[PDB]
Design a protein around this ligand. Structure first.
Ligand code: COA
Ligand code: CMS
Lengths: 138, 157
């Protein structure tokens, strides 16, 4: 059930987590009950640049929050998705337009239309924090 | 204000907040409200496995066959996300067993993609088209084969 949907190897994931530092976090939220919140905190705490995306907030965890990925002025390398499977797949094309290298679908966010629209490398049914703990943790 | 109520209904339905859903509906929120891409409260409850909410939405007149701008139906989402009980209720309430999304996928294709044996069995019993082809000409069968699930492939032929 945390079985990856993608066919990538540990080394592929390791490269992604170490090569790229600039992460757009979609569905960022101040709510403690959203996993987007605990993951964003963990990424900030481990040296990543995180740009929260959610049209419902102006700021999340003390960083400016943007309505869409395209609105982010910074370079974006990875798009980390915390939105419904009915919704998340639409960000592949948005990521392509932004020049992102990777689109990462967290648990219960993937829908196969993401494949058809698909760089960019697709990571599917994995967690950035849990992968980082597993591969790069102390 | 209908947009405000619609956005809250969408969210409460997605979150499985049975009580908030009833409150919002008692307050005028429309079960057939849509977001910008055409998703409805029933799409989201189906996608997230909120069974009770699926039932109350339908009882209140929700369109079981609503499609978003990519042709995605509540049955498509329930099938891919592996929600068996929701699949059965949707079918019972008239869901089109052979709806095709933007990619040419039917619920049978989506069930095969995520390897849901029980859901495939149910769709077949309900007249799923075993011969249906997606945009690249592939049947549900083809898909399970490419994925090595030959136990699923055997009932999909
Ligand atoms: C996806 C998930 C959030 C469920 O979402 P949901 O209940 O269906 O709700 P939505 O996807 O519609 O929206 C979720 C959120 O992002 C937002 N959002 C909705 N649509 C959005 C969009 N198009 N663009 C940006 N943000 C959006 C919200 O407003 C929201 O947060 P909020 O509660 O503060 O308002 C949930 O299943 C999850 O967190 N999955 C990943 C879990 C994970 O991997 N945990 C492991 C950590 S180790
Ligand atoms: C690493 N880890 C330890 C545990 O599983 O006990 C966390 N983060 O949960």
């Amino acid at each position: 059930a945390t079985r990856p949907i993608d066919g990538l190897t540990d080394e592929d994931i390791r490269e992604i987590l170490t090569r790229y530092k600039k992460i757009a976090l979609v569905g960022a939220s101040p709510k403690p009950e959203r996993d987007a919140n605990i993951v964003m905190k963990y990424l900030l705490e481990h040296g990543y640049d995180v740009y929260p995306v959610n049209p419902n907030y102006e700021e999340v965890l003390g960083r400016k929050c943007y309505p869409s990925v395209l609105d982010i002025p910074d370079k974006v390398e990875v798009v980390d998705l915390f939105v419904n499977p009915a919704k998340a797949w639409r960000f592949v094309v948005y990521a392509i337009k932004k020049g992102a290298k990777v689109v990462w679908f967290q648990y219960n966010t993937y829908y196969p239309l993401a494949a058809r629209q698909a760089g960019p490398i697709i990571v599917a049914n994995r967690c950035m924090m849990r992968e980082h703990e597993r591969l790069l943790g102390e | 204000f209908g947009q405000d109520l619609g956005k809250k209904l969408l969210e409460a339905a997605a979150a499985g907040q049975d009580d908030e859903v009833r409150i919002l509906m008692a307050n005028g929120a429309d079960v057939n409200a849509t977001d910008d891409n055409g998703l409805t409260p029933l799409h989201l409850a189906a996608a997230n496995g909120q069974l009770e909410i699926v039932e109350v939405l339908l009882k209140n007149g929700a369109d079981v066959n609503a499609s978003d701008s990519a042709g995605i139906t509540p049955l498509h989402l329930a099938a891919y996300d592996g929600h068996l009980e929701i699949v059965e209720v949707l079918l019972k309430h008239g869901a089109d067993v052979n709806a095709y999304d933007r990619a040419g996928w039917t619920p049978l294709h989506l069930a095969a993609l995520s390897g849901q044996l029980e859901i495939v069995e149910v769709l077949l019993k309900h007249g799923a088209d075993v011969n249906a082809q997606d945009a690249l000409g592939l049947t549900a069968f083809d898909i399970s084969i490419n994925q090595g699930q030959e136990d699923l492939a055997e009932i999909l032929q």
